[PDB]
C-alpha cells in the first residue's frame, strides 16, 4: 500500500546489513534489497507516467502551459548566454587594440 | 590568362587567384598563407641546416647526412 | 632591429592564441545551446 | 500544474537512487581531518535524502488528489489562446536560433582561420 512507504521501507532494508549490533551472506543480501529497491523506483516512476498520460488525454492546456514556460526559459537562457559572450567580445577588442 | 589563374578544384568548384596591381569574397588566408609559403621557400635556401658542425663535413642538408 | 622585432611578434601570437582558446570556450557554449534548443 | 508535478515526481526517484548511489560510493571510500570531512558529507547526503523522500510523498499526495479514463483506452490504434501564445514564443525562438547561428558560424570561421595562419608560420 502507497508505493512510497514500500519505497522507504525497502530503502530501510538496504541498510539493514550495516546498522546492527562473510562475502556471499552479504552478497545475495545486497542483491536482493538492491533489486526489490530498483522495482519499487521503477514501479514509482510508471505510476507517475500514468498519471501525467491521463492528465495530457484529459487536460492537455496545462501541458501547454508547460511548454510556454520551458520555450521562455530557453529565450532568456540564450539572452543570458550572448551577452555573457558580448562583454568577452568587448574586453577582447579593447585587448587586441593595444598591439 | 595575363594576371589571373582558374582552376576547378572540385567540379562545381572555381578557384581564382589574381594579382591586382593599383598602380596609382576575398579569402584572406589563403593570400596570408600564400607569403608565408614562399617566405618559407625562400628561407629554405637560407636554412642553419645546411651548415655542417663537424668543420671536416662538406655542405648541405642535415638529414640527408644522416 | 631583429630583436626588437622578434619581440613583437611573439606578443602578437600569445594574444591571439590566447584569444583562440576563449572564443573556443564561448563556442562550444554555444554549441550546445543551440543544437539543443528545442525549436 | 498537475502534468508538472507528475514531472517532478518522477524526477525525486530519479534522484533517489542516484543519491543512494552516491551514498554507497562515499561509504566504500572511507579509510576508517578529512575523516571528520567524509562526516560531514554522509550527514549532508543523508539530510538531502530525507528531504527528497518527505517531498516525494507531498507530490504523491497532490497528484493522487487530482481517473474516469482507463489506460489502454487511450493509445491511437490504426481502425485557443494558448496555441497563439506557443506560435509567438515558437516565432520568437525561431528568430533567435537563426541569430545564433549566425554568431556561431562567425566564431568557427573566425577560430579556423586563425588556427590555420598561425599553422602556417613555422
Known sequence: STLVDELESSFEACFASLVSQDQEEIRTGVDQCIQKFLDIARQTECFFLQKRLQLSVQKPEQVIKEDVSELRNELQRKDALVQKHLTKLRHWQQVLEDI | ?66 | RNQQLRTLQEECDRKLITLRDEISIDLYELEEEYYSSSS | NTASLCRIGQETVQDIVYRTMEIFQLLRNMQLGTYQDRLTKLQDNLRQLSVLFRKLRLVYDKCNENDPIPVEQLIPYVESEERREIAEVNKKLKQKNQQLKQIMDQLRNLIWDINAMLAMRN
Open chain 2, 1 to 66: 590568362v595575363k594576371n589571373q589563374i582558374i582552376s576547378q578544384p572540385f567540379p562545381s568548384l572555381q578557384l581564382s587567384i589574381s594579382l591586382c596591381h593599383s598602380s596609382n569574397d576575398h579569402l584572406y588566408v589563403l593570400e596570408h598563407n600564400l607569403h608565408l609559403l614562399i617566405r618559407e621557400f625562400h628561407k629554405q635556401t637560407l636554412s642553419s641546416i645546411m651548415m655542417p658542425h663537424p668543420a671536416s663535413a662538406p655542405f648541405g642538408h642535415k638529414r640527408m647526412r644522416l
